[PDB]
């Protein structure tokens, strides 16, 4: 027997049980009706919803081989069985072990991650600056300092903050978030071969993929050419050496286009999310000036107005330790995880879960737990604070996922969001065009990502 849910009709299945512009809110409605783990057909897939925080720990924690798989994306069809976001091969294993560990080795020590953040600071902070307090859109500004850093590691390569093909990357991955996000492009999901070539926003995706991953393939080949196997620039060059160290097996991890994919991967992945969090934590903040300004408080006390943030700062700083908690929690920025698949036929409570089956370890539920979290679509810094005042630590910040497929670059993700913001208000104070009061913090399309309203503000210095 399967886990209960609605009676399916041919063709669409349960497509009237769900709202398309909002899946998560269908799914939490779904929950009430048919309790933590329930099933459903979006056309002829299948799918298994787990919902709130023990039928998603136990699906990721206790059945960790069983729903390690990733679910089908045909958007991201150029990339599907390769790299790591959309493998659900047998590559996938070895080649996420392997991107890892060299992540690791490039985020540790005295050129690591906190290093590589704080140079790139300075040409964050450089940038608001030249916008001499007038109005601007914070998009394609702050979006370079996670941008430059993946870069570093992947290309050891730095942009000037308006140089065009810089943008035209940021650009696309921004567009890429925002239309998978959008109604039009969650049908397209779930019935590609109906949808796929008539006309529609899924073709600009589709292109979109392409050109970050044709971009991708030129520096895998440019690097391919100038390599030297004694001294690695970048994670492009471990990769391509760990290809060259099996020319003579059996089965094969690495590819070029293996490798263009494993690093449009990482490319993506590490520019689009950390980008939009900051974007929305701006906004948030405006919304909440008195909030700002016990964070100004906090680091003029603590930092002081000159000094670069470090992360062990973050230690002594547990109000700012709170907000940027309570920015990833109550944002809920991938809110319907992304989609597993069981790996083989497996008993889940009781309930039959097929293999192939697609499997979502719902994470909205789980930021949004009313217990953990009283008041959970507020946004209060004191849901991370104690008794003392001091940062509340929660298992119930699962914004990244956890198990086996755990984001990852979660720990770049997490130093970057508290350096930059750390930095951005040590020397800026910010203002917003409309007053606090009438600020929206509702995301305008919820679908893969949950995206924030469009704004301008204008940075005011601190410093001089
Ligand atoms: C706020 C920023 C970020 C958020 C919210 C986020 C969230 C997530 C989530 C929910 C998943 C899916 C986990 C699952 O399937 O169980 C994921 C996967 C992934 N993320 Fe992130 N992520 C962020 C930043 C990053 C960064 C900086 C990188 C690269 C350095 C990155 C690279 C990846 C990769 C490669 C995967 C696929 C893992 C796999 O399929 O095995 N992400 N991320
Ligand atoms: O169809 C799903 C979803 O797409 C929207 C736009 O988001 O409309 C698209 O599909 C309609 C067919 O149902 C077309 O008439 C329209 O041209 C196309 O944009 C939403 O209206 C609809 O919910
Ligand atoms: C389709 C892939 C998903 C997407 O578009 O945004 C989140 C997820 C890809 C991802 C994983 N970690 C960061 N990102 C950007």
Same mark, same amino acid.
């Given at each position: 027997? &399967? ?11 349960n ?12 799914f ?23 919902h709130?925080?023990?039928a998603?720990?136990?699906?990721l ?28 091969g ?30 790139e ?10 916008t001499?307090?007038?109005?601007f ?7 370079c ?12 390569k ?40 008539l ?16 971009y991708?393939?030129?520096r ?5 050419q ?13 990769l391509?050496?760990?290809m060259?160290?099996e ?5 094969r ?5 293996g ?20 974007r929305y ?5 405006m ?17 002081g ?17 709170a ?23 497996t ?15 719902? &994470?909205?539920?789980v ?5 953990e ?78 995206i ?13």
């Amino acid at each position: 027997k &399967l886990p209960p849910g609605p009676f399916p009709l041919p063709i669409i299945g349960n497509l009237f049980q769900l709202e398309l512009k909002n899946i998560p809110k269908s799914f939490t409605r779904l929950a009430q009706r048919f309790g933590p783990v329930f099933t459903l057909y979006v056309g002829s897939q299948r799918m298994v919803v787990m919902h709130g925080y023990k039928a998603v720990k136990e699906a990721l924690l206790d059945y960790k081989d069983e729903f390690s798989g990733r679910g089908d994306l045909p958007a991201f069809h150029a990339h599907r069985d390769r790299g790591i976001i959309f493998n659900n091969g047998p590559t996938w294993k070895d080649i996420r072990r392997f991107s890892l560990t060299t992540l690791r080795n490039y985020g540790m020590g005295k050129q690591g991650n906190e290093s590589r953040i704080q140079r790139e600071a300075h040409f964050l902070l450089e940038a608001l600056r030249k916008t001499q307090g007038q109005p601007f859109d914070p998009t394609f500004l702050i979006g370079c300092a996670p941008c430059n850093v993946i870069a570093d590691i992947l290309f050891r390569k730095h942009f000037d903050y308006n140089d065009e093909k810089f943008l035209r990357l940021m650009y696309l991955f921004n567009e890429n978030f925002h239309l998978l996000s959008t109604p039009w492009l969650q049908l397209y999901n779930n019935f590609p071969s109906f949808l796929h070539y008539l006309p529609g926003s899924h073709r600009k995706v589709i292109k979109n993929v392409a050109e970050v991953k044709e971009y991708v393939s030129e520096r895998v080949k440019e690097h391919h050419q100038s390599l030297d196997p004694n001294c690695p620039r970048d994670l492009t060059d471990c990769l391509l050496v760990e290809m060259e160290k099996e020319k003579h097996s059996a089965e094969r991890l690495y590819t070029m286009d293996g490798i263009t994919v494993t690093v449009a991967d990482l490319f993506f992945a590490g520019t689009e999310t950390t980008s939009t969090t900051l974007r929305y934590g701006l906004l948030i903040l405006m919304k909440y000036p008195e909030i700002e300004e016990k964070l100004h408080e906090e680091i003029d006390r603590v930092i002081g107005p000159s000094r670069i943030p470090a992360i062990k700062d973050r230690q002594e700083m547990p109000y700012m330790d709170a907000v940027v908690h309570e920015i990833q929690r109550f944002i809920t920025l991938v809110p319907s995880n992304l989609p597993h698949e069981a790996t083989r036929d497996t008993i889940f409570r009781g309930y039959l879960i097929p293999k192939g089956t697609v499997v979502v370890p719902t &994470l909205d539920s789980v930021l949004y737990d009313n217990q953990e979290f009283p008041d959970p679509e507020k946004f209060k810094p004191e849901h991370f604070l104690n008794e003392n005042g001091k940062f509340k630590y929660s298992d119930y910040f699962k914004p990244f996922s956890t198990g086996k497929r755990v984001c990852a670059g979660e720990g770049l993700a997490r130093m970057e969001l508290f350096l930059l913001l750390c930095a951005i208000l040590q020397h800026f104070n910010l203002k917003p065009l409309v007053d606090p009061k009438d600020i929206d913090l509702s995301p305008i399309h919820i679908g893969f990502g949950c995206i924030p309203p469009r704004y301008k503000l204008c940075v005011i210095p601190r410093s001089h």
